[PDB]
């Protein structure tokens, strides 16, 4: 731990993407650091222009209680989640019209928690019935189905090389998978209560599971050990979203205490506090380059912090 | 200065006219959760309504649009997806009055009215429903009416000692449920008795929820 500190990092409320009229459950940052899609709960997830607070698309969706959203790496497919299990993939770059729903991917019995696109054709959902299942989009059916937890999975964080991911169970446990054999790699314990979000190391050697007892833990993929614990006795609430930086050095969490807080890759110092939200934050987003961090708090707003 | 995205902010004002239009329409309609245990009788009231995860029943009654987001059966916990329902107008609990003689077929130890009360306090004493006025339906009136005559009802409640009369014992258990709220100032727990008979009990729900928004308008202007 001879690495020098990084000082106090402050970031300001550079933007205010108002326009929503209910809570917000997911703000996934697009494929080209430019557009974000915000998952409402009134009736309408909309896509944003981050640079100029413009809403390019009002998508009135059926499953009126969204719980996650995702922007495809090809930039033209946005997929709402839900709790009535129909992870309906929407189409954006449509010939001659506004917007359309492509394939209503029914086939889960729990509730959709975090669906993230592996590529433009394979959407890896993660639901609340111990099933983080891959799919095939135009077929409308599953391809594989991953079981091996005991409770239910609450989050998903895809690896950069599109080979594997990590499972955010309620089991105080995280699960390593594969995408080309359907096999258990390892399963990592250490937390106490359920966890709510994982993000991934940008080099693909770790993943930070955000628990509900105010602790993050940076695990491994090759050494079979948790590396660094995150704790501060003044803070007591539950994590809702974890995000690394572009380098994996800075860490952006989001808490139930109406604010973020910025830890370290090794030092675990509460450097930044991105306060300014009324209700709790819900989701984060760190771009493919790093020029923005935006939160998705339940007060119907989003603020982008740089 | 606004080169030719001046038509783009023309559009981003146009759908921001419609998000304010549908958002002022979807706030007039009343959203009401109905939550029930296993076989408590929630399938009869949606059959008494007008009209795989949750369902939704956008019925209406007497110049008011309703929504009705039934839970159905999510196999995961109610500790995880229950955040979504904060801001519901008036939840609905439902228990069958007849669901007291049989024991639940999961462990056969705790009674059904001992487990549904153990499910009632989980949703009346939790953070996200401190001011959502419960409207619980005591269900299966007539099938319990025949049930109370041949039953001393000592299996469910040992502490009660009175007559096994429907106008006494079922009127007792109405006060056995609605005294679980630790905040009897903000949660106006109404009650009703309905079965497959006793039709048009949504006339009560139309007049109950109308006595919630006025109690939620007067509370928000400081008056109450």
């Amino acid at each position, epitope marked *: 731990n001879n690495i020098d500190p990084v000082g106090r990092i402050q970031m300001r409320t550079r933007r205010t993407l108002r326009g929503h009229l209910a809570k917000i459950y997911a703000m996934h940052w697009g494929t080209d650091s430019r557009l974000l899609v915000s998952a409402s709960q009134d009736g309408k997830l909309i896509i944003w222009d981050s640079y100029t607070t*413009n809403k390019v698309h009002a998508i009135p969706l059926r499953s009126s209680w969204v719980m996650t959203c995702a922007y495809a790496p090809s930039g033209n497919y946005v997929a709402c989640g839900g709790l009535d299990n129909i992870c309906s993939i929407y189409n954006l770059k449509t010939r*001659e019209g506004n917007v359309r729903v492509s394939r209503e991917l029914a086939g889960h019995t729990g509730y959709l928690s975090c669906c993230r696109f592996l590529d433009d054709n394979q959407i890896v959902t993660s639901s609340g019935d111990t099933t983080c299942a891959l799919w095939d989009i135009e077929t409308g059916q599953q391809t594989t189905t991953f079981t091996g937890h005991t409770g239910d999975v609450m989050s998903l964080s895809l690896a950069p090389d599109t080979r594997l991911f990590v499972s955010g169970a309620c089991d105080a446990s995280a699960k390593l998978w594969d995408v080309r054999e359907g096999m258990c790699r390892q399963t990592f314990t250490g937390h106490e209560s359920d966890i709510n979000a994982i993000c991934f190391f940008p080099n693909g050697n770790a993943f930070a599971t955000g628990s509900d007892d105010a602790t993050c833990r940076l695990f491994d993929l090759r050494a079979d050990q948790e590396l660094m614990t995150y704790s501060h006795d003044n803070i007591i609430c539950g994590i809702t979203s974890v995000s690394f930086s572009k380098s994996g050095r800075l860490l952006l969490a989001g808490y139930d205490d109406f604010n973020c807080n910025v830890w370290d890759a090794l030092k675990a110092d509460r450097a930044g506090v991105l306060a300014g939200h009324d209700n709790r934050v819900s989701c984060l987003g760190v771009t493919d380059d790093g020029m923005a961090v935006a939160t998705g708090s339940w007060d119907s707003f989003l603020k982008i912090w740089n | 200065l606004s*080169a030719e995205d001046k038509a*783009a902010v023309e559009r981003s004002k146009m759908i921001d006219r419609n998000l304010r239009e549908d958002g002022e329409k979807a706030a007039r309609e009343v959203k009401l959760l109905l939550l029930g245990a296993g076989e408590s009788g929630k399938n009869t009231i949606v059959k008494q309504m007008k009209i795989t995860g949750i369902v939704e029943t956008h019925f209406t009654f007497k110049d008011l649009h309703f929504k009705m987001f039934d839970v159905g059966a999510q196999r995961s916990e109610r500790k995880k997806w229950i955040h979504c329902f904060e801001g519901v107008t008036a939840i609905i609990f439902c228990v069958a009055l007849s669901d007291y003689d049989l024991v639940l077929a999961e462990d056969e130890e705790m009674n059904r009215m001992h487990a549904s009360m153990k499910l009632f306090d989980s949703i009346c004493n939790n953070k996200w429903f401190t001011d959502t006025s419960i409207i619980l339906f005591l269900n299966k009136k007539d099938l319990f009416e025949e049930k109370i005559k041949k039953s001393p009802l000592t299996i469910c409640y040992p502490e009660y000692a009175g007559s096994n009369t429907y106008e006494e014992a079922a009127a007792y258990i109405q006060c056995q449920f609605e005294d679980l709220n630790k905040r009897k100032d903000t949660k106006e727990i109404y009650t009703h008795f309905t079965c497959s008979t006793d039709t048009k009990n949504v006339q009560f729900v139309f007049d109950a929820v109308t006595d919630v928004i006025i109690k939620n308008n007067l509370k928000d202007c400081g008056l109450f």
Partner: single-chain antibody
Amino acid sequence: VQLVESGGGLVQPGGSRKLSCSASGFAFSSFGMHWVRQAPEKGLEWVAYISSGSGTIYYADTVKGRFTISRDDPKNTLFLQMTSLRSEDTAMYYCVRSIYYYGSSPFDFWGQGTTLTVSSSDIVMTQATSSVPVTPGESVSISCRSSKSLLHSNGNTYLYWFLQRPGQSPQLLIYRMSNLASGVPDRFSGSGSGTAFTLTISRLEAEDVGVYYCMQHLEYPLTFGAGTKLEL
């Protein structure tokens, strides 16, 4: 996917007519509708435009005051009613569908076009060549210039290429001078400075031999130039 027009005939100068570009095949209400016309031997010329939801109504400065225009959105049409018809307004009128957001493609689908026989400040760009004869299989590049730096400070150049196959509507090819549209192959390429522009048409084929065009889109009104015809 479909646009139809009507309202032709032979009127003396001093008459009136209500043109009717009826709309179908798409969600018409959330589109921008332009009214580019073509001289019977010379180039294209913008006339009028209505925004989405009858918003920013414009006009061309040459017809600034004489023509009335509206849209019946429950009928999905355009009411180009003309008053005091002049002899210089002989055109085969086109009715263009445009849409404006980030990463969009305005002027993507055009009208089919009906003719109109009448009897008897401004940013202006220029063409490069009126005609260039090329035998196919040669990878011809064409160029264009203007009288302004069309490289506005938000980082994008507002010039839209086109192509008119001889007889039919002017199909778009390249939008924002560097982005391939939908329906063109991956052999074209555009580039350009603030003022000068170009287009690389590599490996010529059948039927993509018509007259080319250009359109600045920095400020209104819109210019087209005489258009580079391609010969064989």
